[PDB]
């Protein structure tokens, strides 16, 4: 494990209810920074259908975290889903044998992988064409750098949810659905 | 399932505790004050959240030992009651064990 996957805000919206000195815009479906009347945070401002009891301005989940905010002048109910949070997991065959790796992102669709790792100088510049091919979507995230086959072998390196991976055959990393044993009657 | 969901809900509900500091929001600590005197408040919050994480992990280790004792018993019962016939009294049910 190397917990790295943090997607980043593209822009900021400091929308105010047709008032104090300014209002910016409303944005949907993308990873943004929001400050609705002093509510600084990072999220995805997708719309919703929650009846919101007109004096109320905030919404909370089970764990008292800010969930749905009304539009302050358009008066429409918008969810907060903070775009963040994966884990990078690294599949290697051992460095004495090869130096090529495969990378698992633990909980995402990787229609939306390619944006960012960002801490100090770790950076998008690996990623901008290393998405490419060899992208396989599992139920344990999605896996980059390994090629799916229809054979069924013994488990060598356990990815998860019934998927294992190995290194063989112009050698490469393969990923397969693991086999339980020899068939018998 | 109830113990696992209960421990996770306890761990996420302990993020709103101040532990004696003035706030539970980090930007309100970095606004409204100055950093050499906010430094002791964020050390108070970091030490409180670290003790919350450590006391989560300790009960997870104790419960994992309990589940491991139960799983070793289930592996013994599968080897001895399912894959064979047992002579041990009340190990595979009440009465003389058939299968």
């Amino acid at each position: 494990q190397t917990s790295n996957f943090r997607v980043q805000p593209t822009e900021s919206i400091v929308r105010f209810p047709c008032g104090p000195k300014k209002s910016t815009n409303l944005v949907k479906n993308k990873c943004v920074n929001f400050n609705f009347n002093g509510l600084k945070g990072t999220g995805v401002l997708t719309e919703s259908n929650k009846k919101f009891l007109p004096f109320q301005q905030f919404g909370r989940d089970i764990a008292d975290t800010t969930d749905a905010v009304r539009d302050p002048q358009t008066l429409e109910i918008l969810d907060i889903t903070p775009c963040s949070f994966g884990g990078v997991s690294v599949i290697t065959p051992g460095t004495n044998t090869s130096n090529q790796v495969a990378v698992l992102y633990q909980g995402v669709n990787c229609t939306e992988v390619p944006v960012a790792i960002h801490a100090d100088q770790l950076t998008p510049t690996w990623r901008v064409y290393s998405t490419g091919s060899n992208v396989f979507q599992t139920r344990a995230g999605c896996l980059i750098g390994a090629e799916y086959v229809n054979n069924s072998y013994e488990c060598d390196i356990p990815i998860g949810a019934g998927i294992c991976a190995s290194y063989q055959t112009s050698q490469s990393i393969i990923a397969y659905t693991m086999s339980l044993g020899a068939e018998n009657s | 399932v109830n113990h696992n969901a209960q421990a996770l809900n306890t761990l996420v509900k302990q993020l709103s505790s101040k532990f004696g500091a003035i706030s539970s929001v980090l930007n309100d600590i970095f606004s409204r004050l100055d950093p050499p005197e906010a430094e002791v408040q964020i050390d108070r919050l970091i030490t409180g959240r670290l003790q919350s994480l450590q006391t989560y992990v300790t009960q997870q280790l104790i419960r994992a030992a309990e589940i491991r004792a139960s799983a070793n018993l289930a592996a013994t019962k599968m080897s001895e009651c399912v894959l064979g016939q047992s002579k041990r009294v009340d190990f595979c049910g009440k009465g003389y064990h058939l299968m």
Binding site: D61, I62, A63, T81 | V1, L8, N9
Partner: peptide
């Protein structure tokens, strides 16, 4: 009642179906 039932898409026995329905597993997103 213990052998697998080939009609259902999950090839489980009827007893395993009742054991799966009686254990009930959003707070997950929070």
């Amino acid at each position: 009642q213990i052998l697998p039932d080939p009609s259902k898409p999950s090839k489980r026995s009827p007893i395993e179906d009742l054991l799966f329905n009686k254990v009930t597993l959003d707070l997950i997103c929070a």
